[PDB]
Subunit: 114 residues, 3 copies
């Protein structure tokens, strides 16, 4: 999987361990081993959510399978929990876009997963 977070929280307020925490927790939640999981956090962003510039996050989670109605409901609890605790973002200021990727449309190591 690949998990991306864009946030207006400043870089100094992103804990140094956050990437590693996300990687480990996503491995558990998706059932995918952590060596396959990539995480990207982008702080200091110029953003607004409902017209307000209080802390917020726009995220995406891409996975080959392990995406669906029930699974996505669970991931949102996990990820809102993490963003709330580590970045102090209110969970009603978090969007997460979920993407079920076809293996043919994911490149890696000179090839694709198809």
């Amino acid at each position: 999987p690949m998990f991306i977070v864009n946030t207006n929280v400043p870089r100094a307020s992103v804990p140094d361990g956050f990437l590693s925490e996300l990687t480990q927790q996503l491995a558990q939640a998706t059932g995918k081993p952590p060596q396959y999981i990539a995480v990207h956090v982008v702080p200091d962003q110029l953003m607004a959510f409902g017209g307000s510039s209080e802390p917020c996050a726009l995220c995406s989670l891409h996975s080959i399978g392990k995406i669906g109605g029930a699974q996505n409901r669970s991931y949102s609890k996990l990820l809102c929990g993490l963003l709330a605790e580590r970045l102090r973002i209110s969970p009603d200021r978090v969007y997460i876009n979920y993407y079920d990727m076809n293996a043919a449309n994911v490149g890696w190591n000179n090839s694709t997963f198809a």
Copy 2:
């Protein structure tokens, strides 16, 4: 909805008011309530369009519905007009990717919109 703009124009050329203006204009264009609209502007990017580094923008608009042939033409006129007037970007150096998101694939506040 959520609207993201990535651009090579400098941060100082982004008007005060710009995020609020996008929020309001998108509320009106989509009919969606402004409290659920997120906007994200990323200036100072290293970009090329047609191999040229003149002002350009790469954007995305995600919505649960309100996406399609005619609506997307209307959004493009709206949003290129805004990028031209406020950021001085020529409409032929703007791409906007539209995404009709399934509600089950949009997480918010410990759940999804499904």
Copy 3:
């Protein structure tokens, strides 16, 4: 097409001309005219891949058609090759997400394609 690379390698490590090279090589690979190819490179990112903070990249290639099984394997070879030779990123630390876009969902020049 549009091609986006996010990487933790420093800005100084991106060689002069890299966005021109990507534009030219993507024109040859996709058959699309270079004047319509957009490229966006984002260095100095906070990222991890498999829990390691060693050089890595997360990319996307969007195209209206010219996306599929064999074509994507060819794009991955090309692009991993360039990231390795120009940015010194190991191909096994690169993910590329491929998107076949509907023309009606791509805005440009105050309208959309068809």
